[PDB]
Amino acid sequence: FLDGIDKAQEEHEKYHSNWRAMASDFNLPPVVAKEIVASCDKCQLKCSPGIWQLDCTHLEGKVILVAVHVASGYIEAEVIPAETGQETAYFLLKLAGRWPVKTVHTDNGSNFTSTTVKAACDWAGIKQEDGVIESMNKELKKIIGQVRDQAEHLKTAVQMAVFIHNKKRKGGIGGYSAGERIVDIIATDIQT
Amino acid sequence: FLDGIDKAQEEHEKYHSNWRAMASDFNLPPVVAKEIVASCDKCQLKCSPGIWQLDCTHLEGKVILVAVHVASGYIEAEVIPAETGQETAYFLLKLAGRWPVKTVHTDNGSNFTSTTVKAACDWAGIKQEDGVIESMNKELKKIIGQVRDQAEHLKTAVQMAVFIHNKKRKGGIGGYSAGERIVDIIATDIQTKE
Amino acid sequence: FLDGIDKAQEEHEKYHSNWRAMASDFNLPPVVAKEIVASCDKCQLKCSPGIWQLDCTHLEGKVILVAVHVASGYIEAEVIPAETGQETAYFLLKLAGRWPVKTVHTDNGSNFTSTTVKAACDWAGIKQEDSMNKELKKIIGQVRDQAEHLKTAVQMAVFIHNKKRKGGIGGYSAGERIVDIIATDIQTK
Amino acid sequence: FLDGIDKAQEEHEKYHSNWRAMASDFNLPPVVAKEIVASCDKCQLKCSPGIWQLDCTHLEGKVILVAVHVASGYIEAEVIPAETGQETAYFLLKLAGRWPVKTVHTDNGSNFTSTTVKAACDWAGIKQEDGVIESMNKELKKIIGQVRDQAEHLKTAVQMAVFIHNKKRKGGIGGYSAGERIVDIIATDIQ
Ligand SMILES: [K+]
Ligand SMILES: [K+]
Ligand SMILES: [K+]
Ligand SMILES: [K+]
Ligand SMILES: [Zn+2]
Ligand SMILES: [Zn+2]
Ligand SMILES: [Zn+2]
Ligand SMILES: [Zn+2]
């Protein structure tokens, strides 16, 4: 924005760099960078920021509910006392209260297909369209693995793992964490 | 955007229009409009994004731990079994992996002073210290009352109240909800730091 | 209105949304939205549409009489010759025949308590009673070099303040709010 | 409003009641009653809201600048020291600052063709275009005439006349005053 728009346009004119590259290189907010790619004839832009995947995983005989913001890879997970629609519904309401949950992809099992979960979704305005999860499950279990001895109860280990996953594992063009990506993707979405 | 920055910038030299006005009047994303105001040397746009306030409030014989993002008004709350450091620590831990929590302000209750919470804060790199909290518990309790009927258990009502507060109560110059504001405050605090 | 009442009703049934929000979200006239709230047992509605605050301020050695529509924030102002009741009463007369002014709040200012003002108030059916100055001053400052006489700069600032400073749920200007507020009062009359 | 919207609609499918009738018979706000009419295939709910007519009239050797909001009949008037662009431009600025003035219609006087007035218009975003204002011009003088002895200076007499015209002369299907019509017209055009 210190002429970042013109510097970026010339750069794109010659090399046709994607928006992530231009956003990072010239310090432009994503909405601006994307518009440049939009204005180009020889290009095109590159999951809805409101799509989430939910599923349960098991460890130490305990149940863990996991939610994954597909577009960013941001995770939210909790050790729940029982694989019941009620516990899942409660978990959804909380999730829905902090993020713009629009549609949730889940399996057609007893729990996620329960009437309680459906009630929550209806209330929250979440449509259920019912391996991004197999990856998260195993990455989360690995982080829990590498940090398990720092906590007596799994609950805490799990929360430590979520913390590490969303804030201490960086990558990509901007070298962002998953936590910064969800916040960025959604702030950008608000911009349009 | 269709050379809108151009027109907006022109109109601004004359009227020195609000960012909300230029965004609306010229169909520009608010961040671009805000930049026009920042560029103008006759105007100026109008709390640290890492400051949160925690407190325990009571309703129907239950305990509700509430966390407020001071700069945004964004809330996060939960019914906990009892007012203990273990519950507080766990709550804090979940909060921290979710948002960039750097400083936390509390009332000094034994639960916030506990070694368990202190250990939680050290682990997650959070500094402890110590009207927003008070006023907020009131607004939440009020929404809880309006919604109580729709739920059997209070914990569900509490969560509906949080949802409503963060997403369905808008206002301010931007007409945003606290949920939309925190994402803006934090996303911005990232860019500047890049 | 395209079955917007129906949609707003269910939104409120769950989240008990305020009337401004429902008016804006479902494109319903304020009177319809406020009725949804009034019908609900869990809520209560939302300053009187006819209340105005009148004051004087100075700039460049001149007197600026400022009138503020408390509920909307809309403003009206003008450079007057002297801070005398006579000028104040004439200003009021002009205002009153423009907006439904029912009550005017002011200080004990000599020119605000003069008999000539009460005369004007009594004629127009206005009842006398009893920060915006700073905002006006500030806008005038951003626009000063665009005008010669202070008069014109003042009006330019009023224009700016009333039409180019949007905000709130509907992103309205003070100018749009006062009209909407008053039109809405006509609906419930 | 107490299910009155429902009743009103039922009756309309039968009588095709006027909006004033329904607003009155079912205690509904006029805007709700107008919608019912607009929603009916068999009925029709009967000038641009941004158009104003401007002109000067004389009385007692002084100049009165009058502005008319054509769609509502609403008025704004003032005694100006002289028929010059300088005075017209200041007047338009004040006006444009309170109402959404999009286009002004005037005669050909150098009074309104002045470059001073053109600068004022360009600044306020108003378009120019050199007998709706003749009727108001005469009725204003009439009201002034009957209220004159109530004020020492012409200045105050004129403002009393404007006040009376805008808020004390009702009519039309809605039984509204010009002051009420412009607001309704402007508020509706906003949405
Ligand atoms: K493209
Ligand atoms: K600035
Ligand atoms: K009520
Ligand atoms: K019709
Ligand atoms: Zn390209
Ligand atoms: Zn400016
Ligand atoms: Zn309600
Ligand atoms: Zn009909």
From TrEMBL, chain A:
Signal peptide: none annotated. Residues 47-186 form the Integrase catalytic domain. It is found in: Host cell membrane; Host cytoplasm; Host endosome, Host multivesicular body; Host nucleus. Residues 3-44 form the Integrase-type domain. Belongs to the retroviral Pol polyprotein family. This is Gag-Pol polyprotein. It comes from Human immunodeficiency virus type 1 (HIV-1). The gene is pol. The chain holds residues 716 to 925 of 1003 of the full protein.
From TrEMBL, chain C:
Residues 47-182 form the Integrase catalytic domain. Residues 3-44 form the Integrase-type domain. It is found in: Host cell membrane; Host cytoplasm; Host endosome, Host multivesicular body; Host nucleus. Belongs to the retroviral Pol polyprotein family. This is Gag-Pol polyprotein. It comes from Human immunodeficiency virus type 1. The gene is pol. The chain holds residues 716 to 926 of 1003 of the full protein.
